[PDB]
């Protein structure tokens, strides 16, 4: 009856959000996905609770851009026809963009399944 939690380290990935360079990571409690614009010393501009994330999608390998797209639960007063909130992070590490995207994706999918 053993219980295991994930033990990989939390990555800090070079990513662009709405055409600004920054760092995508998770909070230490692994409850929030946070993006902070460079220099990365101010507060996050995107903070998405993992409990509110309903989907994770990626550009397929070989695409022009390496992007992860996260979808959130609809906001409380959203109109029923409206698309759900979404957040696209382009991975910009010149050699490691796809590997960094895969690392975050894998860590996120584990946490999302564990909750
Ligand atoms: Cl933290
Ligand atoms: Cl940094
Ligand atoms: Cl790729
Ligand atoms: Cs990294
Ligand atoms: K590009």
Numbering used by the authors: -6 to 108
The authors write:
We investigated the introduction of cesium in form of cesium chloride during the three major steps of protein treatment in crystallography: purification, crystallization, and cryo-protection. We derived a step-wise procedure encompassing a “quick-soak”-only approach and a combined approach of CsCl supplement during purification and cryo-protection. This procedure was successfully applied on two different proteins: (i) Lysozyme and (ii) as a proof of principle, a construct consisting of the PH domain of the TFIIH subunit p62 from Chaetomium thermophilum for de novo structure determination. Second, a construct of the pleckstrin homology (PH) domain of the TFIIH subunit p62 from Chaetomium thermophilum (p62 PH), encompassing the first 109 residues. Usage of CsCl thus provides a versatile, general, easy to use, and low cost phasing strategy.
For treatment with CsCl only during SEC (crystal #2), a low anomalous peak was observed at site 4. Compared to p62 PH without CsCl treatment (crystal #1) the anomalous peak at this site is higher for dataset #2. Thus this site was modelled as potassium in dataset #1 and a Cs in dataset#2 and the following datasets. The first two datasets that could not be phased experimentally show no or only a very small anomalous signal (RCR anomalous). To obtain an overview for all the approaches, unsuccessful de novo phasing cases were phased via rigid body refinement against models from solved datasets.
